[PDB]
Structure formats: structure tokens, C-alpha cells
Amino acid sequence: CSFGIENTAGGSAVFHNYTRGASNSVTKNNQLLGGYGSRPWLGSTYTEHSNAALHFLGAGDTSATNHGGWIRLLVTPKGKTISDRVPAFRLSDNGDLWLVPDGAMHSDLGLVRSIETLNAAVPRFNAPSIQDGRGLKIVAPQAPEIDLIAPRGSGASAPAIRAMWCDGSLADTTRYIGATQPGSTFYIGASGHDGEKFDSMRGSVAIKSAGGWGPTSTPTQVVLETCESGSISRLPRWGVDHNGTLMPMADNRYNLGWGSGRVKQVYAVNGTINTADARLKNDVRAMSDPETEAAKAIAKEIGFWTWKIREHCGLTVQRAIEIMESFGLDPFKYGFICYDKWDEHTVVSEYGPANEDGTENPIYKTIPAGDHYSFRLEELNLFIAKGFEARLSAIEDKLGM
Amino acid sequence: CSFGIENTAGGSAVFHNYTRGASNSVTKNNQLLGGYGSRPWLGSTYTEHSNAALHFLGAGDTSATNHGGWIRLLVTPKGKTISDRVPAFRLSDNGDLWLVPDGAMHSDLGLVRSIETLNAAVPRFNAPSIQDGRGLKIVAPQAPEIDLIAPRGSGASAPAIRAMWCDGSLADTTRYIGATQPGSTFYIGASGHDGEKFDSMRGSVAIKSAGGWGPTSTPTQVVLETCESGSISRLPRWGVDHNGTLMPMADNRYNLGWGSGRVKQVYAVNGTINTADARLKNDVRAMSDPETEAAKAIAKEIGFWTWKIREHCGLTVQRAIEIMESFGLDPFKYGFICYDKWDEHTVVSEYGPANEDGTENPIYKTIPAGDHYSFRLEELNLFIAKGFEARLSAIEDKLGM
Amino acid sequence: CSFGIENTAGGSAVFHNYTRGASNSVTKNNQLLGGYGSRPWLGSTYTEHSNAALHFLGAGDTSATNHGGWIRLLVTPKGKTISDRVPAFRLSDNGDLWLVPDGAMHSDLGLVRSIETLNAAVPRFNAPSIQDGRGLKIVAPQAPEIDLIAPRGSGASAPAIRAMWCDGSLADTTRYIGATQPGSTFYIGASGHDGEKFDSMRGSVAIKSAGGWGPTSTPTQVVLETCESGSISRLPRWGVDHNGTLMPMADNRYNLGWGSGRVKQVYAVNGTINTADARLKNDVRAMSDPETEAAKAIAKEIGFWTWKIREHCGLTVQRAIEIMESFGLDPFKYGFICYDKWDEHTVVSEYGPANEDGTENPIYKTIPAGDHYSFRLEELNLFIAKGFEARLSAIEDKLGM
């Protein structure tokens, strides 16, 4: 039944495991320094090893400068024997916790306790060891996961992942803690192996302080970052600013939509602001006579059309192209006529239902290669307008007006 | 004071718990196979059970094919007795870690160690058991949470959640690791009970590889996904591409803004590109005489207005509607005249300060029902322009030009 | 070798630590109630304290109403002695798990087991204690982190963080579980110290239920939220709705782009919808003669320009400004002429490669102060159009038409 150690005097009641190296030498790296474990009864014998256990192990060979030690907990899956038991919890000597469930690592890697030791055991892995000592690492086949199960009760289901930024340190005698500083960030993103190693994140969401904080001001922003094909460095692309503006994170560089991914429409209050600054342009030349002629002819093409229930006003780019060429102009040297083309490509179209193999089941779809003819209607309207101006000036001269 | 087991020869110093079933039968499922626990002193006695403890338990009845075993750690909240102690840490036999703090589960569920065993104990729960063996599960009343506390020291507060994608396996007899493959994703999202069960995520942010990776190319994208009312399958909606484009994830399907959520304004460098492709349209018919007449009359309505202060150029939709109808036209059959209506609805307007009941405190607001009359100004300009064209052609004929 | 406790009768085989206060008084808050620990061999002695250990400790002074107790696990980093061992795993009496790796907290704080106890030990910290009992807390210098290592095997690398919403409770006798309710949210965001305390999140991504759920309907939305300079309350800014619309979360409040962060261009199918509602405007006045005169003159400026290879149609704002002023008008009282200026500011331009000090290495860049002259081309076209209308009416009167 019950075995116990008692100290009646007010001191500690503690159990110790004492272990040596061979022939009184120092204890070694990964040597089992101590253990506690259950052995269940099979009917007439106990198991030969523990089915659940706590192990104390060495971290490096013991010496006057190294007393390194780490911990793991071992479990045995239902339906398996102690030959297939799993060191699923490993508390590294650096203080990190590794969670390595059944199926994640071969039993040859049962002594891995860090990125450094994992790199050594799997030479091609090459993850950054600067990530050691930072907290929790989960290794699982395919889909390592954190589930936050949140019953509402009488309030709200509101799971959360919360960074807590501050100035200062909990590591010294002083323990100053102060206001969040500029450059405070929280990245939620993905690193990956590139064929040679893992490195920095190449895609992420980042919540950032937008300046230093004070009791009346705690500004932030949220930024989405991606890495381009043929490149190995991620860039901030789009973000929401402290004032709520949704903006590209570089000027005159990123689009909204593309040929095979067009916005259906925009609801705005004010008109789009387009820069038309003399300092960024060459001189504005007058239109040639063929250009003016084409401008006049294009105005005659304006009518009404439908798609394949309302009547839309305008013309086709193909019609404008024929008119342009009939006056000897190359239509694609003009900014109001656009052509976009794209290759065949595959996209996630939807998600299947959860099944026996996983909960997240993307359904793929192939988008055929294609192309579009398009206008910039603001610039087209101005082209047409110059046509009207030339026609009006010709009339005004004929009436000495 | 101090109790110890010593092995001087270089072997292990290990403690074992040996337990049987009743009458020498096999140990049973959830049977306590071993235990270590503290019992504090009340003045003249010790507590009847341990206030903090490590338990080794069976996972399934022991047999020649099952040596299953799992672990939990128990703690007792300050201000409570050992009747209310909490098995807060449960290392499942599958290797998952369950964190179940005080107030999360009734004591009847102290032996729950998996989604399978939780489903059996709570028949209406019905979570997917495919999620077992994947890592960490946290159960807490209302707001299970992970906090990443990040003192700056002399650097930057930069907490991070990092997926680490790779090809290969750590699980086999030979380990192999290679470059991130196509279809690599990282989902941060929410599943929920639908009245019958939990299933796949129905809203999420997803970081994805955009193609396979190599040492000179590690492309990614970030995608936001939601599920529609009346639907049970989430779809990618908007995303930032590897090249930084912000785009809808299906063509000609999603809007920017709506009637009661209009963008204030857009800053663009180039003019909006609108597709005007003959292949997607029916034939462009000429304008009837009433339509041309309305186009001419509408041009006379252009003046300057202010809101209720710069002078803006244009006219009202209501004025255009009267003119349209005065020539016997239904104005709402034309694409340049729009009407939007919305019901009364309630939204989160802001967040209150943290209080004794929670840190996240949304303040609600009711938006009244309403409607708007709107133009598509690009189309309207073209309608007006055809009016000018007809007037110019009528003049040119009268002067034999 | 092997030390063991055996129970042949079918009962438990358990080890107990029995400890008292001084002079038979009750055990005290944070008193070591029990311990298990390895002591490695240095060559001729063992270490004076354990290099790896499990400790059971008191939570509050023991009494008839308090049997509080908690657990920690201690490890010793390779290259250090037991003077510098780390209580890296602390399972609080409330059931929370604290991960505190090497370098995170001074050894004086080794008994911290909660936000309440941390606040008392570090008076300036002032985090919200309502966060106690919610799950996992990770403290690390600068960059606490969670890594999800996901080898593809034969499937896909698909790590996930998954909130699981439901109605009900697992905490009571009743244990009702039901459908996800309205107001269910999942926040991924950042709190921070403001100089006095930590509080609510001030920037975040939030996945939210958009209404209650049922077996045929599980709507969601994704929202990005930030806090403004000079403010201490975060607001929803932009979101993707259940129907996939990307929208500002308040009407007529937020922009897309700004002067130093302009969208390059927009790809839309339909024309931008601009509200032009008589009910929201003052009366549309007719143009004065100087305004009409300027409108006519501006049409003559339309030609072609290039940036510093295609020919773009239009004119400069500076040219329009001179014409406006030549007829005695203030050009900046008119909505189609815009001027924006911005101060010098610093932004993250790029991410450096991973180095020995960290994986996430932002490279900064200074954007000089600057300004732009811009048009609203839709409004400008209408201004020009009125010029044409006045010219046509003058001709028609002269020919008695």
C-alpha cells in the first residue's frame, strides 16, 4: 500500500537517485540519472520496463563546470507494448518543453531535447538553434496542433492568443518593468525547409506597436507579409494602420486584384485620387491628327450592352483597337488600352467536410489560361473629351466665333 | 530528511510501482498503477489524500498486446481542500498534453485523457477524434488562452508563433528531411459546435506555401477565409499573394465595401482597369432617341455642391432619375444608376477597458436601416459623352461639314 | 539497481512525502512539501543539490480550509552548475502551466506560480489576474515562442491553431453542450505594458461567429483591429464578412491607401459606386462664368505624357491650377484638385537573413517628407463636360437651333 518519508522537524522530505559513470567516472551525457515508473501486471508477471515513467537524464558529461540535467515523461499508447513507448514530454536542460506524441519521432531520437541535438541526430534538418530556450515546441506527423476548447457557460466563448509586450527584465535583481517600446512585434507565421535548412519566417501576420506607448496612447498596426517566387526574403505587403487605413506597405508597388482575380466592385464615398504631378512626368505633348481622328470616331461607338439584366454604357476594347489601327496607331502604346494574360493555375476552391483522415480538407480546382481586354475608363474619357474639343474648335473657327 | 537509492557500478537508480488487478488479474483501464504525492500537516494530522501528486494510470486493461499507460499531475487551489484538487496536467497515452485548469472540468471527468474518452463521457460533445495525438489541448471556462510574456531587455519584445514546414519524416528507421512542398499550410482558425458536433474550421487566417520551395525561392501567401450564412463550408475570400497583390480569391465575386460600409476614398497611381471584352458581352446596340435626349439633358445638370467644405462637381441621382423618366425610360434598367438598401443591424463599435470579469469587452452599437442613391461615374461620363457626340453631329450636318 | 513498492492485492502502490512546519505548526506557503531528484557523480562526490527534480510545494499556509499545493520541475542547463538551475515548468495551484526557460526569470522569482504572485514580487508588472486559470503562460527574454514542426510524410504539412467554440459547460453536474452562440470570438493579438500596467489587447486579428450556428449554417468573419495614437481602445477597422466582402467596419471612415502608400492599381469588373444622394447634399448650384471659362480652357490642355514607356492621356494638376487662378478662382476650394503632404517617417522595408542573435531581423528605411498634387478624375471629367455643354449651347443659340 503506502510508503513514506517523514520529517517531523520542519525540514524537507526528499527522495534522491544517485548514479555514477562506469568505474567511478563522471556521469555522462544522456545517462539515466534517476527514474520512477509503473509496471503493470500481465496475469503472472510484470512488464519488463515501465509503461509510464519519469526520467532524469544528464545533459553533457558531468564536470566541475557542468551539472547539466533534463527530464522526460514516457507513456505507452493503448494497444501497444512497452517496446513502443513514447517519450512524449521532454523538458530540455535549456527549459524548453518539447511535445512529441506517438508517431512523431522514431525511438532512435528519444534523447533529442533541443534543436541543437536534433540537428546533430538528423544532419539535414538544420533548424536555427537560436530558437532554443524560447518555450514550447510541438512535433507531430503532418499536423501538429493546439486546440483551445472554450465552453461559453454564462459568458462568451472567447479563446485568445495574447502577446504581452513590455520594457525591462525579470532576469536581474532590479526587475524593472515599463511601457511597450517602439519595434515591439508579434509574428504569427511559417518558416520552412528550403532544401538545405530552415531560416526566418517567409509568410506572416504581424501585430506591431506603432510607436512607444504611454498610459493615454497605445497605438498598433496589423501587417500581412509574403515572399515572392524567386526570392528568399519576405516583405510587408498590406497592413491596417493605427488610424484604420488599409494600405500597401510600399508606395506605387502593389495592386488590388489581377486579371483572373478581379474585384466585383468598389463602394467609395469620394472619387479615387490619382496623382497627376508635373514633377513626375515628362512634358505633355499635343495630340497628333490621327490621334484626334481616332478620338472622334471612338465617341461614335458608345452605346449600350449587356453581359451573357441591366444596360451598361460603353464600347468594346476590340472595337477601339480596330479604330486605332485604322488611323495607323499602335493601340498598345496607349495607357487606356490594357491586355492581361495568365497561365493555367491551381487554387483551393473550397474545403471538404472533416473525414477519418483529417479535419482540414482543401478541394482543388484548375483555372484555365486566359486573357482579358480592358480599358482605363478615366483616361479613355479624357481621350474622347479631346476629340470633342477639336470638333468644337473647328466649328467655332467656321463661324468666326 | 533525505532518502536515496544509489548505484555505484554505473547502472541506473530507479524506483518502481508494482500493482495488480483484483485476485491477481491484469491491471485495468484507468487503474492507479503508481503514485507520488505530498501530504501537508494540519497541526496534529496530515491530509487524507495528497494535495500535489504524480499519478501513473492504465490505458486499457493490460494484456499481451496492451501495456497502455498515461500520466497526470494533480494540484490543489489555494483556499480549497483536497476534495477539490485538480488533475490539471494530463499526458495522454497517445502523447498529447491536456491542460485543464481549475473550473474547466467537473471531477467526474478527471480520467478523461483524449477526445475519444471525452466524447464517451459527454455524449453530445462529438469532437473529431482525428485531432488526438497532434499536440496540446487547453480546456478552460470561456477563455482558454496562451500568453507570451516578452520583456524587451536590451533587444526587442518579439514573441512569435512559428510553423515549421518540411518534406520527410522523423518517424522512420532512416530519417529524411527536404524542401517545403506545395500544399503546405498553417491555419489559425476556429471550429465550433453546430448543435450536433464539432468539425472543420469555419473561419481562419492561413499562411500557405505558393508552390514548392528551393534554396533561392520560398514563396508564400496569406489568406483570410470565412463561411457564409446558410452554408457549412468555408471559402478563401481575400489574400495577399507572393508578389504582394491583395486580391479576391475568386474572380468577379467579392466586393470592396458595401452600402453601410463604404470606403472613404482610394489613393491609386493608375486608373482603375475595367474589363471591356467583346467576348464576354452581347452586341453593343446604338442608343435610342429618348436615351440620347436624356443624355443631353443630364449634362445641363452638372454644377457644384457641398455636403451638409470644398465644392464638388456633379449632380444628384434623384435629378437624373426624373430626367430619365421624363423621356419614358426606367432609370434602374441602366448600370450607371444604383440603389442600395440595408436593414437595421448591430455591430461591435469599440472595446471597453479591461475589468474584473475579462480583458476583452466589446461595446455594441445599432446602425439604423437606410438606403443610398449612387452613380457609376465612369459609365455616366460615357452616357453624357454620347449626348455631346449626337449634338456635334447634328451641328455638323446643318453646316454641311 | 531497482527499488520497488508492490501491492499484490489489487490496491495502489504509492509513495508519500510528509512534512511539517516548525515546531509542529502547519506547513507554510511555498514550503517544499516533497521532492524527487537526481544527483550526478563528479568523480569523488555527488552534487550538493539535484540537477533535475520534481518538487511539491504549498500554496498558502495549510489550514482546515486550505490544502493548497503546486508543482514544479527543475532542470540544469548544459555548461552550468546546480547554482543556476531553472524551475522551468511550474504547474500552478490554479492549474495553469508556466513555462519559464533559462534566462527568463531571476532565481529570486523561482516561487512565482501566477500573475497574482508575479505582481506581488514585481510591483511594477501589474498584469490582469483575471488571466490566471486560463491555460498556458510562456515567459522568455525578448522572444517567447511556440514552434509547430510539421513533417509532410505522405500527406501535407498542415500545422494548426484551432479554437473550439461551444455553448455550455463541462464544469458542473449538468454538462450541457450546444451550438456556438452569437458573440463567440477568437483573438490573436497583443497586450502590452503602458507605463503603469498591462490591460486589454490593442491590436489583433479576430475570427468571430457571425450569428449563432446550426447544423446547416456556421457563418464567420475575420476582423483586423488596431488602436490609434492618443487612444487606449482598439477598434475593428477592416474585415472579411461571412459573404466574402472585404469591408471597412465603419461607414465612411477608413481609406484604402494614402499619399506615401498608394495602390498601384485596381482591377474591378464593374465601375466604382459613388453615393450621389440629394438628401446628403446641399443644392447643386450652377457654375459661374469664370468656372465655365476655366472648364473650357482645361479641355485644351489634354494631351499625352510619359513618366520619367506607354503614352498616358491627360494633364498636370499644376497646369490646371494656373488656369484656375487665371480666372480668379482658388483651385483648392474645388474637390477635383488635391494636395497631400507627409512628414519623414521610418518603416520596415525588408527582413534580413536569420543570424546568431535571432531569425526575425527587420531592416528599417527612412521615407523622406514629401507631397503630391492629384486629381479626382471622375469629378474633373464632369467639370470638363460642363465646359463642353456651355460651348454647345452657345453654338446652338447662334444657329437658332
Residue numbers in the entry:
A (entry chain B), B (entry chain C), C (entry chain A): 989 to 1296, 1304 to 1396
Q: What is the paper's account of this structure, in its own sentences?
A:
The well-studied Siphovirus T5 has a three-fold symmetric tail-tube, to the end of which three long, L-shaped fibres are attached. These fibres are made up of a homotrimer of protein pb1 (pb stands for “protein band”). The L-shaped tail fibres are responsible for the initial recognition of certain Escherichia coli (E. coli) host strains, binding to the O8- or O9-type O-antigen of the bacterial lipopolysaccharide (LPS). The bacteriophage T5 L-shaped tail fibre uses an intra-molecular chaperone to fold, which is then auto-proteolytically released to yield the mature protein.
A single point mutation (T to G), mutating the codon of the corresponding serine in pb1 (Ser1264) to code for alanine, was introduced into the plasmid pET-28-pb1(970–1396). Expression of the mutated gene in E. coli cells led to production of the non-proteolyzed version of the protein, which we call pb1(970–1396). The resulting model was used to phase the structure of pb1(970–1396) by molecular replacement. Three trimers were located in the asymmetric unit, and the intra-molecular chaperone region could be constructed by a combination of automated and manual building in the calculated electron density. Serine 1264, the residue responsible for the auto-proteolytic cleavage of the carboxy-terminal domain from the bullet-shaped domain, is located between the bullet-shaped and intra-molecular chaperone domains. In the structure where Ser1264 has been substituted with alanine, the chain continues with a loop (residues 1265–1276) winding around the other three, subsequently forming a hairpin (residues 1277–1322). Three 50 Å-long hairpins (residues 1332–1371 from each monomer, containing beta-strands C' through F', protrude upwards and embrace the preceding bullet-shaped domain). The intra-molecular chaperone domain (ic) ends in a central triple-helical coiled-coil, to which each monomer contributes their carboxy-terminal alpha-helix (formed by residues 1371–1394). In the structure with the chaperone, two short beta-strands are present in the third interdigitated region, forming a four-stranded beta-sheet with the C′ and F′ beta-strands of the chaperone domain. Although the interface between the bullet-shaped domain and the intra-molecular chaperone domain appears extensive, it is only 3 × 103 Å2 large and the association is accompanied by a free energy gain of just −12 kcal/mol.
